Amino acid sequence: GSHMYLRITNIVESSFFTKFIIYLIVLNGITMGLETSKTFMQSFGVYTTLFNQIVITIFTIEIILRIYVHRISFFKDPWSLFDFFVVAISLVPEILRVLRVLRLFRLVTAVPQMRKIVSALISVIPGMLSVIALMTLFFYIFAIMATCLFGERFPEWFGTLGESFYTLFQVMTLESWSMGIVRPLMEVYPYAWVFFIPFIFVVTFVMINLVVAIIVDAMAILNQKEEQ
């Protein structure tokens, strides 16, 4: 709480400061779409690599100041921890060059209207873990069974626990599940439909129950407020 501290804290917690930073995120945003074009990169490639290293310096300063002001309150703030990690990524000198584009998610971290909706969304998840747990177990058990039942004749789709996880996931989205996977399978395993139809019933029932549960946990609130 010294004189220097508060001088900084006045700049950081400024309107102008955020608006500045949101202006840059949006500008880098546009920059990163243009950098997607070889034509654009063939002419103005120099300029945008300059602008990229500028912005990422500015954001390191920005994150350093914010730490000066906020102390370990910073490192217990999700939105700040996010901002930390997306800028840190951008600092390391081939998948990482791409993961840089995750800095545009700073538009979410910095615009309150965005933060609101992301919070609303994420707060739905705790009441889902039990069902997600059930489901992940359901899949593990089926992935094993399928790997034994069909891996040898159908290595592409079932040769491996992971091939089976992937294929079972595809069947749950109902993508080409019959013409793509089960119809071919039955050409060797007449009774394969006894594995896949029950699998599709369980998985779809649980998804429906999952969504009904989000709709109720939501109404539970509205029918506490209106009880007052």
Ligand X SMILES: C[C@H](CCC(=O)NCCC[N+](C)(C)CCCS(=O)(=O)[O-])[C@H]1CC[C@H]2[C@@H]3[C@H](O)C[C@@H]4C[C@H](O)CC[C@]4(C)[C@H]3C[C@H](O)[C@]12C
Q: Of the two residues 11 and 133, which places its CB atom closer to ligand PX4 in the complex? A: 133
Asked if residue 83 binds ligand PX4 (CB under 6 A), the reply is no
Q: Of the two residues 62 and 163, which places its CB atom closer to ligand PX4 in the complex? A: 163
Q: Which residue is nearest to ligand X (CB)?
A: 15
Q: Which of 6, 11, 96, 214 binds a second copy (CB under 8 A)?
A: 214
Long-range contacts of 50-55 (CB under 8 A, 24+ apart): 51/27, 52/28, 55/24, 55/27, 55/28, 55/31
Q: How far apart are alpha carbons 54 and 205 in whole angstroms?
A: 52
Number of Cα atoms under 13 Å in the Cβ half of residue 136: 6
What separation in angstroms does the CA of 15 have from each of 47, 66, 141?
Answer: 29, 14, 54
* 151 known member of a binding site: no
Q: How far apart are alpha carbons 194 and 196 in whole angstroms?
A: 6
Query: Which residue ranges make up the site for ligand X (CB under 6 A)?
Result: 15, 18-19, 22, 111-113
Q: How far apart are alpha carbons 143 and 158 in whole angstroms?
A: 8
- The 49-88 site mask, x for binding a second copy (CB under 8 A), equals ----------------------------------------
* 162 known member of a binding site: yes
* 173 known member of a binding site: yes
Q: Which of 10, 14, 53, 119 binds ligand PX4 (CB under 6 A)?
A: 119
Asked if residue 11 binds a second copy (CB under 8 A), the reply is no
Q: How far apart are alpha carbons 97 and 86 in whole angstroms?
A: 12
Maximum CA pair distance of the chain?
A: 80
Asked if residue 127 binds a second copy (CB under 8 A), the reply is no
Report whether 161 contacts 147 (CB < 8 A).
yes
First-to-last alpha carbon distance for the chain, in angstroms, is 43
What are 24's two structure tokens? 């840059």
- Stretch of residues binding ligand PX4 (CB under 6 A), selected from 12-20, 59-67, 87-95, 129-137: 129-137
Report whether 84 contacts 43 (CB < 8 A).
no
Site residues (CB under 8 A) for a second copy? Answer: 29, 32-33, 36-37, 97-99, 101-102, 104-105, 107-108, 113-114, 116-118, 120-121, 124, 130-131, 133-134, 137, 140-141, 144-145, 147-149, 160-161, 166, 169-170, 173-180, 193, 197, 200, 205-206, 208-209, 211-216, 218-220, 222-223, 226-227
